[PDB]
């Protein structure tokens, strides 16, 4: 089809949406940036939703999290590590690559269910209990979440 697909990327932890418009057959990266400021990520649990009528999921990863679990059936993932994952400056938390099959307008959403941040205890090289920050708990976001993170949702041609 010569008509296009507009993809809007949202997340509970993103104040703004991302958007792009693409040709049928194009490959598209939808990714979510997380910046943990002067802290690090300890734990995350998330689920991603998309419309299989319009997109085909080609890959789903946590590019910064080598020991993360991605469930391709449920389109979800999780990670937890006492050594932490350094998201200072902003890094990709989740990246989904799709092929555009259909046309119109569609939403891709990252639902962050759990998110805990922390800092290392220089004496141990593992997370300091007193540093831990409960950013999201069972889908409930902290009142001061955006004092502790920056985030962004991006939709771009795949390279």
Which of the ranges 15-23, 84-92, 96-104, 106-114 carries the binding residues for Ca ion, by CB under 5 A? Answer: 15-23
Which of the ranges 2-10, 35-43, 81-89, 123-131 carries the binding residues for Ca ion, by CB under 5 A? Answer: 2-10
Cβ closer to Ca ion: 4 or 126? 4
Q: Give the C-alpha separation, 147 to 159, whole Å.
A: 33
Distance of closest approach, residue 22 Cβ to Ca ion, in angstroms: 8
Which residue from 15, 21, 23, 105 is in contact with Ca ion, where contact means CB under 5 A? 23
Residue 59 contacts Ca ion per CB under 5 A: no
Distance of closest approach, residue 35 Cβ to Ca ion, in angstroms: 34
Q: Give the C-alpha separation, 116 to 42, whole Å.
A: 6
Q: Which residue has the tokens 């703004």?
A: 16
Residues 106 and 51: beta-carbon distance below 8 Å: yes
Cβ closer to Ca ion: 22 or 133? 22
Q: Using alpha carbons only, what angle is made at residue 25 by residues 23 and 28, rounded to the nearest 5 degrees? A: 75
Which of the ranges 4-12, 58-66, 119-127, 134-142 carries the binding residues for Ca ion, by CB under 5 A? Answer: 4-12
Cβ closer to Ca ion: 44 or 55? 55
Residues 38 and 148: beta-carbon distance below 8 Å: no
List Cβ neighbours of 98 (8 Å cut-off, separation of 6 or more): 7, 27, 28, 30, 50, 55, 56, 57, 58, 108
What does the binding site for Ca ion look like in residue numbers (CB under 5 A)? 2, 4, 23
């Amino acid at each position: 089809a010569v008509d296009n697909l507009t993809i809007n990327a949202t997340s509970n932890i993103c104040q703004a949406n991302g958007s792009g418009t693409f040709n049928v057959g194009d490959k598209v990266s939808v990714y979510y940036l997380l910046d943990t400021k002067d802290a690090q990520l300890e734990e995350v649990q998330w689920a991603l939703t998309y419309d299989k009528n319009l997109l085909t999921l080609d890959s789903l990863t946590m590019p910064e999290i080598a020991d993360g679990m991605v469930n391709m059936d449920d389109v979800s993932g999780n990670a937890s590590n006492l050594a932490l994952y350094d998201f200072a400056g902003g890094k990709k938390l989740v990246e989904a690559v799709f092929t555009v099959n259909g046309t119109g307008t569609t939403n891709v959403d990252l639902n962050v269910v759990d998110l805990t941040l922390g800092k290392l205890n220089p004496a141990t090289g593992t997370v300091d209990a007193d540093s831990e920050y409960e950013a999201v708990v069972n889908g409930d976001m902290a009142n001061d979440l955006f004092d502790h993170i920056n985030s962004d949702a991006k939709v771009e041609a795949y390279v």
